[PDB]
Amino acid sequence: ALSDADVQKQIKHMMAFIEQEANEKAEEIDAKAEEEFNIEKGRLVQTQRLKIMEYY
Amino acid sequence: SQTQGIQQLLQAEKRAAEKVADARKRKARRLKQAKEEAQMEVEQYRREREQEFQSKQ
Amino acid sequence: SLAEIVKKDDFVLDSEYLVTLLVVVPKLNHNDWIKQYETLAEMVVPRSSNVLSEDQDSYLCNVTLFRKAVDDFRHKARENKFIVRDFQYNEEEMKADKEEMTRLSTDKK
């Protein structure tokens, strides 16, 4: 009947969340990664700072 | 959409899996960056403390 | 069971968010779903009019659609004489049952 019109419509509808939600997931995992380089810049190495300053 | 767009959906989900996997690889990359960069900052601060200690001596 | 009638590929293996609900329709209404499938539910796979098999009591057939949309399609389709029968394919277990049958027959003699 409608040939490829419904194909285009429905397939793009599935696209618009299949790829978009994964893209948002990647953005927020990179945000967690952002916070985590902040954490490791001040968690392990900062424990070593307290150690070396106590040594001094 | 017997085969036209369902294959496109499969490809999009494969792209999603690859993107999240590479985002986790970038997490590992930047975690190692934090390790290294902060350690060099520690080396610099240690040099500063050495200087102040020689002054105190 | 449909062990020796259908194949593993008749449904969507590795479905993303979809289910090939095997809505067996009688022969009095087989010609209707092959056109109404588009409207009977939305967020589904178009051109899902492919029949599987035809039987004396009711013609085997199926349709692919979203997991939450299984409910909606069933509720819309039960009123147009579209009997719902979710069949699961298994080569191993059907083969094991048939082998058990033959074993029992020979051992019984």
UniProtKB/Swiss-Prot annotation, chain A:
Its main location: membrane. GO terms for molecular function: ATPase binding; proton-transporting ATPase activity, rotational mechanism. It is found in: Apical cell membrane; Cytoplasmic vesicle, Secretory vesicle, Synaptic vesicle membrane; Cytoplasmic vesicle, Clathrin-coated vesicle membrane. The modification N-acetylalanine is found at A1. GO terms for cellular component: apical plasma membrane; clathrin-coated vesicle membrane; cytoplasm; cytosol; endosome; microvillus; mitochondrion; synaptic vesicle membrane. The modification Phosphotyrosine is found at Y55. Expressed within the midpiece of sperm tail (at protein level). Kidney; localizes to early distal nephron, encompassing thick ascending limbs and distal convoluted tubules (at protein level). GO terms for biological process: proton transmembrane transport; synaptic vesicle lumen acidification. Keywords: Acetylation, Cell membrane, Cytoplasmic vesicle, Hydrogen ion transport, Ion transport, Membrane, Phosphoprotein, Synapse, Transport. Belongs to the V-ATPase E subunit family. V-ATPase is a heteromultimeric enzyme made up of two complexes: the ATP-hydrolytic V1 complex and the proton translocation V0 complex. The V1 complex consists of three catalytic AB heterodimers that form a heterohexamer, three peripheral stalks each consisting of EG heterodimers, one central rotor including subunits D and F, and the regulatory subunits C and H. The proton translocation complex V0 consists of the proton transport subunit a, a ring of proteolipid subunits c9c'', rotary subunit d, subunits e and f, and the accessory subunits ATP6AP1/Ac45 and ATP6AP2/PRR. This is V-type proton ATPase subunit E 1. It comes from Mus musculus.
Swiss-Prot record, chain B:
It is found in: Melanosome; Cytoplasmic vesicle, Clathrin-coated vesicle membrane. Residues 33-53 have a biased composition (Basic and acidic residues). Disulfide bonds: none annotated. It comes from the Eukaryota. Transmembrane segments: none annotated. Belongs to the V-ATPase G subunit family. V-ATPase is a heteromultimeric enzyme made up of two complexes: the ATP-hydrolytic V1 complex and the proton translocation V0 complex. The V1 complex consists of three catalytic AB heterodimers that form a heterohexamer, three peripheral stalks each consisting of EG heterodimers, one central rotor including subunits D and F, and the regulatory subunits C and H. The proton translocation complex V0 consists of the proton transport subunit a, a ring of proteolipid subunits c9c'', rotary subunit d, subunits e and f, and the accessory subunits ATP6AP1/Ac45 and ATP6AP2/PRR. Subunit of the V1 complex of vacuolar(H+)-ATPase (V-ATPase), a multisubunit enzyme composed of a peripheral complex (V1) that hydrolyzes ATP and a membrane integral complex (V0) that translocates protons. V-ATPase is responsible for acidifying and maintaining the pH of intracellular compartments and in some cell types, is targeted to the plasma membrane, where it is responsible for acidifying the extracellular environment. This is V-type proton ATPase subunit G 2. It comes from Mus musculus. The chain holds residues 3 to 59 of 118 of the full protein.
Curated annotation (Swiss-Prot), chain C:
Ubiquitous. Abundant in brain, liver, kidney and testis. It is found in: Cytoplasmic vesicle, Secretory vesicle, Synaptic vesicle membrane; Cytoplasmic vesicle, Clathrin-coated vesicle membrane. It comes from the Eukaryota. Subunit of the V1 complex of vacuolar(H+)-ATPase (V-ATPase), a multisubunit enzyme composed of a peripheral complex (V1) that hydrolyzes ATP and a membrane integral complex (V0) that translocates protons. V-ATPase is responsible for acidifying and maintaining the pH of intracellular compartments and in some cell types, is targeted to the plasma membrane, where it is responsible for acidifying the extracellular environment. Subunit C is necessary for the assembly of the catalytic sector of the enzyme and is likely to have a specific function in its catalytic activity. V-ATPase is a heteromultimeric enzyme made up of two complexes: the ATP-hydrolytic V1 complex and the proton translocation V0 complex. The V1 complex consists of three catalytic AB heterodimers that form a heterohexamer, three peripheral stalks each consisting of EG heterodimers, one central rotor including subunits D and F, and the regulatory subunits C and H. The proton translocation complex V0 consists of the proton transport subunit a, a ring of proteolipid subunits c9c'', rotary subunit d, subunits e and f, and the accessory subunits ATP6AP1/Ac45 and ATP6AP2/PRR. Belongs to the V-ATPase C subunit family. This is V-type proton ATPase subunit C 1. The lineage of its organism: Eukaryota, Metazoa, Chordata, Craniata, Vertebrata. The gene is Atp6v1c1. The chain holds residues 165 to 273 of 382 of the full protein.
